Amino acid sequence: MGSLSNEKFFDISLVDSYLNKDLKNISNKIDSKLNPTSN
Amino acid sequence: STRYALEHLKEGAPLKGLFSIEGLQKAWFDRVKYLDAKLNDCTNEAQQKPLETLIHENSKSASKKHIVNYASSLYNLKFSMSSLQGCIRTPPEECPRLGPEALLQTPDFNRTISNEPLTTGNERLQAALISSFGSLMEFRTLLINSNLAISGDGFTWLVARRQLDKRAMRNDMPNRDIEYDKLFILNTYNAGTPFNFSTSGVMNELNNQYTNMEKQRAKEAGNLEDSEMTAKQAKTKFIYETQQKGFSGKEVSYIPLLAIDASPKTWLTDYGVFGKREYLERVWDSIEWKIVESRLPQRTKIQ
Amino acid sequence: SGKPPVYRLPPLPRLKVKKPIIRQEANKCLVLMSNLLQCWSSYGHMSPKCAGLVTELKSCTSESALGKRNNVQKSNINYHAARLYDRINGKPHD
Amino acid sequence: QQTKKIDQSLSKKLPKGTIYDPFDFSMGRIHLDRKYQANKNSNRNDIMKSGANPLEFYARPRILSRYVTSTGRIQHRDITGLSAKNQRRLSKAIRRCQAIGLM
Amino acid sequence: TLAELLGRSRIAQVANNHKPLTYTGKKFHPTHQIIETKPSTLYRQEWGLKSAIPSKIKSRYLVYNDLDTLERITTFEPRGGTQWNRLRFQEMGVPIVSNIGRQNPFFKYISRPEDESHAKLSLFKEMKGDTDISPAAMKKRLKKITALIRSFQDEFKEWLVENHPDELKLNSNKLEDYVVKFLNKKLETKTNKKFNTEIIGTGGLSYSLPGKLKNSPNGVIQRTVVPGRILNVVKENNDNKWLAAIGGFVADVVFFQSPPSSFNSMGDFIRMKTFLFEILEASMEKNGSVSMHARLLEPQ
Amino acid sequence: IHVVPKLPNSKALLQNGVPNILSSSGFKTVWFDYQRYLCDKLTLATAGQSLESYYPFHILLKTAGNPLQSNIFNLASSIHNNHLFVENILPSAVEHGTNSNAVVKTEPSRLFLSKIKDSFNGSDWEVVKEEMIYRAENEVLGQGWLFLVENNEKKLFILTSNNNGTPYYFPRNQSFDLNSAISIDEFATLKQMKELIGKSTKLNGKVQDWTMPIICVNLWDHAYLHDYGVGNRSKYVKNVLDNLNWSVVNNRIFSGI
Amino acid sequence: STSLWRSSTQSYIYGEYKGIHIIDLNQTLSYLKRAAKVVEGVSESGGIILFLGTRQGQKRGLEEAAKKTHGYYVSTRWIPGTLTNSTEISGIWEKQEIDSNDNPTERALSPNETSKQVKPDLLVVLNPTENRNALLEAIKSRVPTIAIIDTDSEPSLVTYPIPGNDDSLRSVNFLLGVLARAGQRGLQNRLARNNEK
Amino acid sequence: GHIIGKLVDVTEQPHANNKGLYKTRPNSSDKRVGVKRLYRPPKLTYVEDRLRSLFYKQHPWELSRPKILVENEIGDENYDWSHMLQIGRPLDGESVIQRTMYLIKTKQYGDMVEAYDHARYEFYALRMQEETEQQVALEEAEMFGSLFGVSAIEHGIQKEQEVLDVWEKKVVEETELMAARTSN
Ligand SMILES: [Mg+2]
């Protein structure tokens, strides 16, 4: 998985996700699916 | 006679999926009639006594051996035919006669399993077979292989290790006369009792009396006994007793639960020469597991 | 895995052993002496037990000092070597 | 009458759970096992041939201690049986280890 | 053509083997295919190999490694023993019983592949199962598998974010399970079964199933007797753990306390005489060894 | 590969079975089938083994000693005995079907009758046949073979094999069914046989014996079941010896020249 | 084996399998038929055919082939000079005169006739690697030769090579049997022709 | 069926290799000449060999069964491998391999593995049947009055006893010789 790992020892994939908004976009999608509405 | 008649078998009525009218008439009716005629000619006082009682009381007898032979053969044939019910598919006369190529066919007893006793709802037999044979497929292939290997007349039995009621010194005790340890398969040939608590050590006793008679003749003639000969006889005796020495003692009875016939008279007439394996296959799918389930007594799993 | 390599030889005029070590057995009449000397050193000179060994020396010495000598063979390994060297050597063809 | 004691060199102790042949009870078998006696126990236990870098072990005197004779002389390639490069690196390691004075 | 005929030729049927002909180690199973010559054939040194075997060989069975070698010599050995040892096992006829209770592997059970548990050890074996030199096993294989995972990075991400977002948000300890499941499915596809080398079971020693009875002239046998030799009285560890030779197999035998004084009468020569043994059980191990058990029977 | 031999006048036998003995269907049951079955089973047993280069008589001799090689011995003995039976009941060995020389008739040889007189108690041949059937019924319950053999002593006996037991080898006669009770004298004879084989010093545990047969009658239910139904085995054997091919038989007797 | 290969036989080999070179059999068949009817032609012509083989156990095949083809065989070791030094080696053994039917004429031979040399018209060698001196005697004495050539032999020493295995009794017997039968057929044809033209 | 003497030109492969690098120029291997390969004897290989090795290192005791290598007549061999049991040959690993080849040739199954397991299970079934047949045949013979001189167990015991007796003599002689050596 790379960026989503919970290991304190991670790789460059985390940096790639951070710089290119990838991980932020993933978290936003997860929140939008789960956080609001909840109908 | 009525005592040797079955509700499943009727004159002129094929056993569906097993034999035609001719097959039953030749395999069962002709043979049972012949055995009854021979036994009656050989003994008038037979009808009142069951075959099992006759075998138990009369045995190990050279003078009256043929009484036991014929009675046991009749009992064996009846017991084998008792469990047969009739398989829906593949009528006996419908399928074609098998030729030489039937030999090269690879058996599928390793692959296809049919007529499971679970289907009839008998779980006690399910557990007994799984425990004493690991799996149904192993049990089925063992039966088919064993009976098939019999060259001439013989039977294969699903006997049960009925632990002796205190080495046969007791009997009719609650739950013990119907207490067995495990299941086993035995191949009897030419009218051999599946239960071998009787007829066990017969060769041993014959050897014992022979050695004694030889000793008496030697001493009467004055010939001194030879130590090595006695040692050899002791070794033969020791192996014979150690071989047939159950933990309970007095040998272990093997009650019969199910039998499969091997005599060519049963199948040669209709299934042809090459069809023996086919006959066995059709038989396996024609067992009424309710009867054997009822015959199966209680287990020993208590201690 | 990496066992020591096999080293061949340049073509040789012949393959033979100078003085082959052929199997041989002692007379045991000298061994009898060795045991008797051991008995003398431990039990005592011409001690009772040594007497049995003494008689054994007498028996082995009576006819020959070293007893009867036989089973004197020779090793024919040179014969076989010379016989099948031309095949076993693995020399390149002509 | 005969003495009940026999040297191990004349008694083949067959291992458990192994096939055997009648020949294995003959003197031929013991002579064969004696001549063909291999040292594969080393082969499985020499970490040096496992692939590890010998020069790394210069700080562990014991590991090299099994490749030196009683007085410390380095065993020849035949006895050690390592690869040429592994042996040369092992020799450098032990010589270095002597320099630091652990040997 | 000729290539296909050579593929089916009896020489080709024999698997190539380069194991030592004279092995001085523990022997747990045959390591060479026995070749047999018909009497007439042997009469003309026609074993079927490349070159005729020298006349001095009178045995009709031999084991070979190389059809021809640099020294113009056929690497062979006229032993044919193993077949006799197998036949002796079939003499005793004691069936093989699975040690771990594993059900017979001679039956493709429909449910056997179904019932299963997580096997991370398989994941370990996928890269550290090579058990070879460090520069290749620990570097080349690890690089290869890491490259393989690179191709399965986005797919894992989308699946986890789509189907299991709660656990990812919570960082549950169960997250590892999805990783194992994913890798399993990726190496459980078509062509992914690969090949597994391991002794299936009896391995051809005995295709006998338990349960059948050895009906005998004197009656059904309850305990089997076979002549044998007690190998040594030194046993093992002085833990009442002897050894004995029975019909080609070295099998342990159980002794009652105070064993027979026969060994005391003569010791370490006990192999001279023969005894009678019961075969308690025969269960094999992962190495192919058969841990046959026996018991010593003596007249009272 | 073992192949069923070609019999003379095969067309005549295929059209109708041996006259006075078996019907076409019955003969096709014994020969032309269950004989190809026997050959195929034997070939599958010995294919790729040194035994496949030998003939049934030789393989059964070689196999007698080996305990767990009994399948091959059993197969070979059946094949050999069966062909013996077919030959000795063949209507005419000579291929004179086209010539239609039905005048050919077979009668016992004077030497053969003389041998009967020497053997037993000098009884007549018909009495021998009757008592032979008698024993066939009484001491062969299942299948087996009926033999009139000749020993080294020049005295014909009757061997009541209860299975595929070749007369050639008395250790493998299988003449006493041990499954049923056994008399004291028979068990004594068995123990004597135990001793006799034990005396042999050969590494293969074999014993000399000649006892080659003269008359073969198949007692397997593959022969009479169809033609003679069940229990009529006595009538089957009776008619078999009635029309026995005598030319081959009296030839089987050692002419002494 | 490959470690023994002689490169001069590269064209005769089909490849290597299990550590040994595999001879092409189409070529072996073509050469064998050529050699076979060379033998038949010589036998029909009425020449002398010599069958040479010195490996152990070959004598039976040589003797049988010689008697079928009315030729000669040498299962013992070839004697150097048998062809170049014939008068010294074989000058002491006596000969005979035979007619077109291979029937002796029972006529005495003058000393000069006996002292002459009889030269085989065809030489067949089963182990040309060991009988090299026999091949060199033939090449020097102008006698065509047939030999079984393995992946170790030199095909240029023999007029008519037969690529095949030479270390197996079955192979040499099979090849030599085909050659002998061809020679026998030639002899029968000659006998028929001279009996009836 | 591999082709000797063919060189894959750079133009033939336009796509990137396993490492994502486009091949644009011939490499050192392409420079070299390959006449030796043309004249080298080809190295013959068959897929069946891998299976044969796998089988015999999965069924070690299958080696115990002797195999005759003297071919009878390979040309006159008509085999329908739908059923591996075939007159003229025995039941052995080769039967498994041929059956697997036939299964794949007909394409009834997929990869090597499945066809191999199918054939293997068939081979188990036939072998179990044969072993049971031999055991029951033995039982038949003894039940019916069959005499046996020497069995495999007793044959082994007797030969072992011969070797042991020779060994006994040798060891006593060696012991007294060792007594001689140490008595010095
Ligand atoms: Mg050669």
UniProtKB/Swiss-Prot annotation, chain F:
Gene3D superfamilies: Iron/manganese superoxide dismutase, C-terminal domain (3.55.40.20)
Record-level GO cellular component terms: cytoplasm; mitochondrial inner membrane; mitochondrial small ribosomal subunit; mitochondrion
InterPro entries named among the record's database cross-references: Mn/Fe_SOD_C, Mn/Fe_SOD_N_sf, SOD_C_sf
One example of a Gene Ontology biological process annotation: mitochondrial translation
Protein function: Component of the mitochondrial ribosome (mitoribosome), a dedicated translation machinery responsible for the synthesis of mitochondrial genome-encoded proteins, including at least some of the essential transmembrane subunits of the mitochondrial respiratory chain. The mitoribosomes are attached to the mitochondrial inner membrane and translation products are cotranslationally integrated into the membrane.
Gene Ontology MF term list: metal ion binding; structural constituent of ribosome; superoxide dismutase activity
Subunit comment: Component of the mitochondrial small ribosomal subunit (mt-SSU). Mature yeast 74S mitochondrial ribosomes consist of a small (37S) and a large (54S) subunit. The 37S small subunit contains a 15S ribosomal RNA (15S mt-rRNA) and 34 different proteins. The 54S large subunit contains a 21S rRNA (21S mt-rRNA) and 46 different proteins. mS42 forms a heterodimer with mS43, building a large protuberance adjacent to the mRNA channel exit in the mt-SSU body.
Entry keywords, A to Z: Mitochondrion, Ribonucleoprotein, Ribosomal protein
Family: Belongs to the mitochondrion-specific ribosomal protein mS42 family.
Note: Present with 2060 molecules/cell in log phase SD medium.
Protein source organism: Saccharomyces cerevisiae (strain ATCC 204508 / S288c) (Baker's yeast)
Annotated localization: Mitochondrion
Record protein name field: Small ribosomal subunit protein mS42
Lineage: Eukaryota, Fungi, Dikarya, Ascomycota, Saccharomycotina
Superkingdom of origin organism: Eukaryota
